[PDB]
Amino acid sequence: MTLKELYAETRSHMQKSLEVLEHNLAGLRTGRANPALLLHLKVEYYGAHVPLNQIATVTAPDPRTLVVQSWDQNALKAIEKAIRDSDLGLNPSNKGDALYINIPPLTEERRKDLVRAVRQYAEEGRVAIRNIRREALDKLKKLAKELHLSEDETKRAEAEIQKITDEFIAKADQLAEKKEQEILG
Amino acid sequence: GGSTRNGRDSEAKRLGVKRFGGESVLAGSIIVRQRGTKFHAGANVGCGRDHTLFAKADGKVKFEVKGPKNRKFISIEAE
RNA sequence: CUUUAAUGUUUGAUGUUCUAACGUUGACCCGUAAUCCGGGUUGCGGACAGUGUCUGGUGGGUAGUUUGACUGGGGCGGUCUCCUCCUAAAGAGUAACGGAGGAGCACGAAGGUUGGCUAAUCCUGGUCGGACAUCAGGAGGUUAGUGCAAUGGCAUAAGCCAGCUUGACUGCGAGCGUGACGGCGCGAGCAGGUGCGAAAGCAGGUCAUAGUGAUCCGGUGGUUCUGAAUGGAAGGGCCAUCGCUCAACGGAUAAAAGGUACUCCGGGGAUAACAGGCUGAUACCGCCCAAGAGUUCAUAUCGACGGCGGUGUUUGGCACCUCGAUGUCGGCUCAUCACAUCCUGGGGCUGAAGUAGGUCCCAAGGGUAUGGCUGUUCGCCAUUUAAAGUGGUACGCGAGCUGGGUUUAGAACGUCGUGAGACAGUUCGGUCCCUAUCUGCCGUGGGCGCUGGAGAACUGAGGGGGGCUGCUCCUAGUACGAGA
RNA sequence: GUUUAUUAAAAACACAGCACUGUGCAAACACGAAAGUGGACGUAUACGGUGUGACGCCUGCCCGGUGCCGGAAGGUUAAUUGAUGGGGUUAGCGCAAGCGAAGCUCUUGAUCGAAGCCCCGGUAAACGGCGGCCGUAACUAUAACGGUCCUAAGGUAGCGAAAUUCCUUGUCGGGUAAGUUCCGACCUGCACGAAUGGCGUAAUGAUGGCCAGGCUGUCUCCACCCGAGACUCAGUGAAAUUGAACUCGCUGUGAAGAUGCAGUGUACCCGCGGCAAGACGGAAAGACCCCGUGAACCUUUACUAUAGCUUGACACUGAACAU
RNA sequence: CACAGGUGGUCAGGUAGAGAAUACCAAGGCGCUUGAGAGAACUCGGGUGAAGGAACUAGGCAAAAUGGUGCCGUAACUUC
RNA sequence: GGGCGUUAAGUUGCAGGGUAUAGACCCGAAACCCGGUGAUCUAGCCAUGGGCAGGUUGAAGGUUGGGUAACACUAACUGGAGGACCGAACCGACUAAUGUUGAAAAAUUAGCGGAUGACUUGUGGCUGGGGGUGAAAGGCCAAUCAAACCGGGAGAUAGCUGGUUCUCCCCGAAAGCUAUUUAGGUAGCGCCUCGUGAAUUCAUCUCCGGGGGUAGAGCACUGUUUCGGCAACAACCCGAUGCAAACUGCGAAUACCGGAGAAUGUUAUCACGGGAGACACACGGCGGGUGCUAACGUCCGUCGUGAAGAGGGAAACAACCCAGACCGCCAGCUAAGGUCCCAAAGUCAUGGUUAAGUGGGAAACGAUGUGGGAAGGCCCAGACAGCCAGGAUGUUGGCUUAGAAGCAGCCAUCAUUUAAAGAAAGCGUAAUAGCUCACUGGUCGAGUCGGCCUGCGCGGAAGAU
RNA sequence: GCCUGGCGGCCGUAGCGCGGUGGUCCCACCUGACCCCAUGCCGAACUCAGAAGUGAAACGCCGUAGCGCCGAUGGUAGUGUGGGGUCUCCCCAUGCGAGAGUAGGGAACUGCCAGGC
Ligand SMILES: CN[C@@H]1[C@@H](O)[C@@H](O[C@@H]2[C@@H](O)[C@H](O[C@H]3O[C@H](CN)CC[C@H]3N)[C@@H](N)C[C@H]2N)OC[C@]1(C)O
Ligand SMILES: [Mg+2]
Ligand SMILES: [Mg+2]
Ligand SMILES: [Mg+2]
Ligand SMILES: [Mg+2]
Ligand SMILES: [Mg+2]
Ligand SMILES: [Mg+2]
Ligand SMILES: [Mg+2]
Ligand SMILES: [Mg+2]
Ligand SMILES: [Mg+2]
Ligand SMILES: [Mg+2]
Ligand SMILES: [Mg+2]
Ligand SMILES: [Mg+2]
Ligand SMILES: [Mg+2]
Ligand SMILES: [Mg+2]
Ligand SMILES: [Mg+2]
Ligand SMILES: [Mg+2]
Ligand SMILES: [Mg+2]
Ligand SMILES: [Mg+2]
Ligand SMILES: [Mg+2]
Ligand SMILES: [Mg+2]
Ligand SMILES: [Mg+2]
Ligand SMILES: [Mg+2]
Ligand SMILES: [Mg+2]
Ligand SMILES: [Mg+2]
Ligand SMILES: [Mg+2]
Ligand SMILES: [Mg+2]
Ligand SMILES: [Mg+2]
Ligand SMILES: [Mg+2]
Ligand SMILES: [Mg+2]
Ligand SMILES: [Mg+2]
Ligand SMILES: [Mg+2]
Ligand SMILES: [Mg+2]
Ligand SMILES: [Mg+2]
Ligand SMILES: [Mg+2]
Ligand SMILES: [Mg+2]
Ligand SMILES: [Mg+2]
Ligand SMILES: [Mg+2]
Ligand SMILES: [Mg+2]
Ligand SMILES: [Mg+2]
Ligand SMILES: [Mg+2]
Ligand SMILES: [Mg+2]
Ligand SMILES: [Mg+2]
Ligand SMILES: [Mg+2]
Ligand SMILES: [Mg+2]
Ligand SMILES: [Mg+2]
């Protein structure tokens, strides 16, 4: 437990929280021009629900059409039978080694639910990150008080802390912003 | 922080290099923590607690080497 | 007489009653055609209360003070004494807030002496024994061990074992080493007596270098030293010795924490803040190699891993100049320079059809936005624009403007503190001086000089001003383009 | 209403109201060494002190610490009294060694000894405090719920990005063309919270912030004009400052930002009206910073003292009786 | 200081006016102890502004505006 | 034995250097203490008088009528409350401007708040300084306030600042050590001055005698590190290669200590005593810690200089180069640095380089620039360039891939035909195609290609009056 | 002069390893052991009384270079004084001059006494 170690700790925890952010974001239907949308889509195969990607390939040739290439044909069938089963309302097409899923222009209602989802998630993220600092800071107070760090040493530590926090918030900001553009595109 | 301190003077060397007036007992060498660095021999001897090459009766410092396996060895002949 | 009670008596505790001290800010009288004061009478209280000497507690109500230093400004953090090594340039010694560690003790044996002994580790072979217990041989050679740091030393061993012991003795000390000094260290030998050994000899503590406290003030033991008229004695001296993390460890007192923005005084640019300077790790800008992406294709555009520079421009470092005062940020106002060029001008390359771009080179003529939000600069946003450049100029500009930010005194919140107060947290309020001598600008005259004196008109060496750009039409709906 | 006369008028003080608490009168308290005096020619519906600050709805949990109130049975303890043992000295006993009474003395402290403290109970409109950690629901996320460490108790009602919110312009909505302010929300309350009061609240306010209509030279963007100086003349007639001035630009140099040094360029001599870029211009031995074994006020469980408050002994101070 | 500051009480005319406000006057007292010119920038105190109208600014600072009597009529809210 | 002592000439005046006590060189605090003077300012309070133009709102109570069993209640009129309203006087002080050597040590002007009240004012009184008074700011207490003013203790104290007065001559530092509530002060030591004593004493050079563990090197030791060799991935050990302040089986120069000797040096040396100042040092060279082998950085060692040294040199420049100023000289020679002009001295001589204004700023890297020196390869069986011809077959190699046919990628990279002919060097296609390349024949008719050692240049090279 | 023993000198080209060799002279080992004296068990070592035995071991010699060890000449590093160029580094003048390594050396050399031939 050292200043540096704590530092790595804050960066870590924030990385995990940020990752949860991406999890929630990709779990959404922007202007649906994203392949990550169906990434986590675990499909039933061999008795288990394998996450689509480890079974198919999702790429967006054009902003209005998503495709899921599956080296295995039998998996392709069951894949489509999974791209739906949700608010996605995506209709996979069977043609060759992949699935052609047209992204219908998104309704304004679902647009509502979608943009909002992007903001609610964005702030949620920030909250976590901020609290992370709060904790990190306390830990620092106890550290300088315990190890006897010059007012300059401790304050310096604080500066480093805030720095980390600020960066991550920036990351959550971008992710939320880009994801949003997709939903608004 | 937590890194400094140090001993003090403590000479411990030759105070009578080669033949000297070597009074009834000078030193000719106080290199303590030793026995072989300056072995006792000849008219001179002593080598007190702090392994200080005493040096008996008056004469002249010699500085030898005699004795298996090098061995400094010091003594004080006369003129 | 001893162990117990009764009456005499005494005296101590609590507790009641009494008046005669003591009080009465009840009533009345006289002094006196007084409200004080005094004396008297009566009532009340009454040995209490109260006061004096002493005395335990309480006692920021008040009062005198303390509240360390080094410190790469101060504070914080750390440090302050002693020992070991390196820094220490082969004698001694040498600095930092240099790099690493230890000590404040341990031992009646772990001391002495005499006699004897010698490890570590590995291989091989052996009940249980296995990685390593003990045993046997061989190699090996002190790489062990040494009470505890580090250094150096150690076989004649200090390392290890046992027997007998008290030299861990007393008085001294030739002569040296080392300190400013106080002191500290080494010491053969001499005298007295000890112990070990046949003896020569060795032993004045440990292998050595840390294991520490001066003085004062007293305590205890010894001594015909002294002893205030004398004999004693108290006490003083002398010798032995005890008492201080006096550790901020040369130790100011026995005894000491803080606040100041209500502040103040003497000093310092010996010393922080601003701006200048030195520097330039950092920062910004440029270049080197070219694995990679670029469909293919290193170098159109970009570039990993690493290399080298330039600038003074960021974040810093130093503390050189100002602390007998160099006004801080922002805005306003008026600028001036640089070019690492934002626009417009000229070009090379293209992953340049065109129109539009991307990138490099050249170029400093001139030009280079209004508002919303905040004190902001910056920044985000709204809408313009050919474009809304980057930077130097004491982060240009207060003897030109403002005074919103920001450091006085008021006040409040969160917050911390027992608290005074405190905050690079917040909040509402909060006096911005100068008639310009010199330089320099800007304008405007007076002299004299240009060789006789005039009235004029020119020449033109030089110097300055000015140098922006949109959009529309025609070329031509043409070249180009599959079209658009 | 009051206030920093002379930078602060306020969100500060004060107030009516509230609550606690002391006070039986010769009151409490306060001035005073004292006498005495205010309190008050008042007397608990009165007076003092403290905190809060109309009004409305209200005012939770903590007595562990500190203080204050009540108890003091026991533990400890002042002066005081001085039992008791030790010592100096000396009559005498003794070549002497030593012993030693009496008296005078030095010392020892038994014993007696109140309050206070310890102790025992209370007290928060007294000073003052009011938590961490882990698990769980059928999308998920969340967790009424369970459990676990420890408190004197673990912040209730209410309120919350607030005069308290660092991250911060938090996110959302309203306003706008655009809003780091503003208004309404959410609650993740760095670090609101119930008389050092919580939340509201009509009226009031030279009070803080936000918006609008009107209004305009505030501004785009200045123009004209009337008067006072400014300018010329006549009279009188200052000021600060000042080592000496024969008082140019630049580039470098330099105690590190030059009118005076080096190099160079430039410039005939002197006024008047204007401007303030420099003379680190003028003004005040820097108020910031640090230093001095400096200073002054101030705090307090810094230290040592002390007024005051209160304890007991003896004195003034006596007579009895019960146990 | 022959200083635009400070200094208690008394008296209370005419017109208009609510009026000891204010404006013009009576009685009464005065032109403030440097004057003459000129008609600059600029400072000071003012009058007026095309169009626009807070774009100013930390902030509408300051200016501009509003203003009287009678009558009509006047919201949330409220301790009425 | 060892320490302290032993014909050691003292002593009293006079002049002077020093010290102690005193104001102790002089000028200066902020404060502390004592005794008085002040409430004609202001702050409270006491007593007694005075003042508020005008305008407005309309409470409580009352009377009559309604209403009530009677009270509530109600409506008119009456009444005339209020820290009530508007607003002069009067009191106050919210804003702006102007003034800031003012008209004025707080005002003027235009706005502004209260204005029958906790109002305002005249008169006189009472509160006294650690005290007062305070609707509380530390505010007022006579333009003075976190302790008024006046006089005194008093020349408080001031390790701080400033300043310290005539002339000449001789010598001449330190900016260190160790202590220090010590760090900008002090005290002993060191260094200076003066006096009195003392010996070849002291210095340099020569030789003689010493110990040494730095530079360097080396890698047995302590670690570190490679590469190989006997390890169900690597220690040990073998050998080959490096590394170290806290490594050393090696080891300088060198300094230092001692002995002898020559010369030289107005005793330089040692001791004692009177008098000091000093205990911020700065730069440069070398050996170094730190810092970035950054800083006109910081800290030690050591030498020189400045400090305390002028002169000449480096443009200008306390330290760096030369060189130490007794004075006068219109003499002569030299150091450093210089010799075309400003500007003293060669437009000097000999051979060579350089062509960029290099000279007269800068790196990695980049280039048929160019001077010198050695050496190699291929070549009239024709080298080198250019020019004409050729570059085929298995085969589109296998895999991979939608396709991969020399040329996405992986593997292989042979054989045949030959004068030569890569399972192919780049471009290119979706893949082929196609184009160019290796290399080969002829032509051509004498040299050509790159390396090496060295000297001088070029680019890279952007800043603010 | 051979050989050996004791004591020293000097402390590696004196040591180590490998082979040969010496013995009733001297040394060893060895015989025995109640005894002097000895074992933290042991006559192993110390200690004593001494046959027989034998040079095995140990030791003393001789040869041998595989491992140590010594070690140039030259050249290199560094360095004192002087000077010069440069970012930390180096060059020149001049004295001094390692280490490592190369050539090579090298299987000790001695003095006193005593005892045998
Ligand atoms: C963190 N949120 C918590 C929520 O998780 C829940 O927490 C309770 C916690 O307060 C209890 O705690 C209670 O019991 C403790 C002793 N066992 C002492 C403290 C007391 N509050 C736990 N026993 C059970 C939790 N589920 O209820 C209270 C809350 C504040 O909302
Ligand atoms: Mg006090
Ligand atoms: Mg005092
Ligand atoms: Mg200090
Ligand atoms: Mg040394
Ligand atoms: Mg020891
Ligand atoms: Mg000390
Ligand atoms: Mg001062
Ligand atoms: Mg300075
Ligand atoms: Mg600075
Ligand atoms: Mg300066
Ligand atoms: Mg350019
Ligand atoms: Mg604006
Ligand atoms: Mg803007
Ligand atoms: Mg000004
Ligand atoms: Mg302000
Ligand atoms: Mg004021
Ligand atoms: Mg005011
Ligand atoms: Mg209050
Ligand atoms: Mg309140
Ligand atoms: Mg409460
Ligand atoms: Mg709000
Ligand atoms: Mg607006
Ligand atoms: Mg005039
Ligand atoms: Mg005149
Ligand atoms: Mg200059
Ligand atoms: Mg002016
Ligand atoms: Mg000035
Ligand atoms: Mg000053
Ligand atoms: Mg006049
Ligand atoms: Mg006049
Ligand atoms: Mg207009
Ligand atoms: Mg206004
Ligand atoms: Mg006025
Ligand atoms: Mg009014
Ligand atoms: Mg009066
Ligand atoms: Mg005195
Ligand atoms: Mg004085
Ligand atoms: Mg070395
Ligand atoms: Mg040395
Ligand atoms: Mg000093
Ligand atoms: Mg010093
Ligand atoms: Mg120094
Ligand atoms: Mg320096
Ligand atoms: Mg000439
Ligand atoms: Mg040049």
UniProtKB/Swiss-Prot annotation, chain A:
Biological role: Responsible for the release of ribosomes from messenger RNA at the termination of protein biosynthesis. May increase the efficiency of translation by recycling ribosomes from one round of translation to another.
Keyword Metal-binding: no
Keyword Chloroplast: no
CDD domains: RRF
Pfam families xrefs: RRF
HAMAP family reported in the protein's UniProt record: RRF
Name this polypeptide is given: Ribosome-recycling factor
GO molecular function, one term: ribosomal large subunit binding
UniProtKB/Swiss-Prot annotation, chain B:
InterPro entries (UniProt xref): Ribosomal_bL27 (IPR001684), Ribosomal_bL27_CS (IPR018261)
Organism: Escherichia coli (strain K12)
Disordered: annotated segments: 1-14
GO molecular function: ribosome binding; rRNA binding; structural constituent of ribosome; tRNA binding
Subunit structure: Part of the 50S ribosomal subunit. Cross-links to the 23S rRNA. Cross-links to the A and P site tRNAs.
Protein name: Large ribosomal subunit protein bL27
GO cellular component labels: cytoplasm; cytosolic large ribosomal subunit
Keywords linked to the UniProt accession: Ribonucleoprotein, Ribosomal protein, RNA-binding, rRNA-binding, tRNA-binding
Family named by the database record: Belongs to the bacterial ribosomal protein bL27 family.
Ribonucleoprotein keyword on record: yes
NCBIfam families membership: L27
Gene Ontology biological process terms in this record: assembly of large subunit precursor of preribosome; cytoplasmic translation; cytosolic ribosome assembly; positive regulation of ribosome biogenesis; regulation of cell growth; ribosomal large subunit assembly
